[PDB]
Amino acid sequence: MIKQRTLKNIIRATGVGLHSGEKVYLTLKPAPVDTGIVFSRTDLDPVVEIPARAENVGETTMSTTLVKGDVKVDTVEHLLSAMAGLGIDNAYVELSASEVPIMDGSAGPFVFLIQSAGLQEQEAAKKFIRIKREVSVEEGDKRAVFVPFDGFKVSFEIDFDHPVFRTQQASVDFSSTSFVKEVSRARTFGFMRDIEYLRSQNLALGGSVENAIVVDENRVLNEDGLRYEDEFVKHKILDAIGDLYLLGNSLIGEFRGFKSGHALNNQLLRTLIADKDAWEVVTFEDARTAPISYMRP
Numbered sequence: 596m597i598k599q600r601t602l603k604n605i606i607r608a609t610g611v612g613l614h615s616g617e618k619v620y621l622t623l624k625p626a627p628v629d630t631g632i633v634f635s636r637t638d639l640d641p642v643v644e645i646p647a648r649a650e651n652v653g654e655t656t657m658s659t660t661l662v663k664g665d666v667k668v669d670t671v672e673h674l675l676s677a678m679a680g681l682g683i684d685n686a687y688v689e690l691s692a693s694e695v696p697i698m699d700g701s702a703g704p705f706v707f708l709i710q711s712a713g714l715q716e717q718e719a720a721k722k723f724i725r726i727k728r729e730v731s732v733e734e735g736d737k738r739a740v741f742v743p744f745d746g747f748k749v750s751f752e753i754d755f756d757h758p759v760f761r762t763q764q765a766s767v768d769f770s771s772t773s774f775v776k777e778v779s780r781a782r783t784f785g786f787m788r789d790i791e792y793l794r795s796q797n798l799a800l801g802g803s804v805e806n807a808i809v810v811d812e813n814r815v816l817n818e819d820g821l822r823y824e825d826e827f828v829k830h831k832i833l834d835a836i837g838d839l840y841l842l843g844n845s846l847i848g849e850f851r852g853f854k855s856g857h858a859l860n861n862q863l864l865r866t867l868i869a870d871k872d873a874w875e876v877v878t879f880e881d882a883r884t885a886p887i888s889y890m891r892p
């Protein structure tokens with residue numbers, strides 16, 4: 596059967612919050628069967644734990660935030676993206692501050708740290724949300740859709756009226772294309788005028804060319820350029836994969852975004868969860884006949 600997984604070993608990492616500019620210590624801990632992903636603010640007494648679930652999403656403007664009372668965890672989507680892509684079911688994520696560290700702007704450092712520690716298969720069936728009906732949400736020119744699909748896949752389109760925008764569409768079937776190789780290294784990005792404005796509103800305090808593609812009116816200012824010709828849309832897919840993991844189970848289906856972001860992705864999640872006719876929970880007694888597959892642990 597397809598079994599739940601956690602970490603084989605605890606993983607420690609250090610970085611800065613994109614928005615806060617704060618130094619943060621991250622610890623990823625193994626977790627029991629059916630824990631899910633749970634963020635832990637260990638700088639607080641008592642410790643505040645927020646399950647990484649749709650119902651615990653806050654503001655959503657700058658990034659994906661988990662909230663419980665007046666406590667938040669900012670910018671969860673790249674780490675959730677990394678765990679989603681390695682099929683981690685159960686893990687405690689401990690943080691010494693309000694924000695997940697941005698690392699290089701991509702999921703790559705998180706996927707490396709996780710795969711170094713290795714995965715542990717657990718004696719319990721992995722549960723899948725299978726998309727049964729199309730579920731779409733729109734607002735203005737943005738749209739986000741679930742479509743039934745015997746596998747897992749993400750299609751995304753963006754349309755910046757900007758000299759840098761290279762391919763603005765991409766589609767990845769993750770049963771036949773490597774999340775690790777093709778998506779995980781895709782870095783977040785910021786336009787210079789936006790960055791200047793957010794800096795002035797005491798936002799983007801951790802930002803640098805070390806953790807973001809910085810774009811002026813014409814070009815990438817990052818000296819060493821891009822990791823993929825289509826890095827911007829690839830990063831949009833990475834963000835979506837992170838947000839999709841707030842469903843609390845792995846997806847069998849296809850996601851399609853058209854200029855979508857954290858707010859519309861969240862509306863899609865709530866709309867899916869609410870329309871119980873559109874999805875079922877499945878398990879797989881036989882991996883060999885399953886529509887999705889996983890790397891050896």
Ligand SMILES: Cc1cc(C#Cc2ccc(CN3CCOCC3)cc2)ccc1C(=O)NC[C@H]1C[C@@H](NC(=O)[C@@H]2C[C@H](F)CN2)CN1C(=O)C1CC1
Nearest residue numbers: 657658672783784785790793799802803804807809830834
């Ligand atoms: C990445 C970033 C970086 C900086 C920054 C910065 C910065 C600040 C200062 C410097 C220069 N300094 C650094 C210190 O040394 C001196 C020079 C460089 C960069 C400031 C803002 C952002 C930003 O929010 N970009 C949003 C981008 C990325 C994407 N979304 C994501 O990826 C989601 C959200 C979050 F982003 C992580 N997941 C969708 N998207 C957009 O559609 C934008 C057009 C709206």
Ligand SMILES: [Zn+2]
Nearest residue numbers: 672783830834
């Ligand atoms: Zn991102």
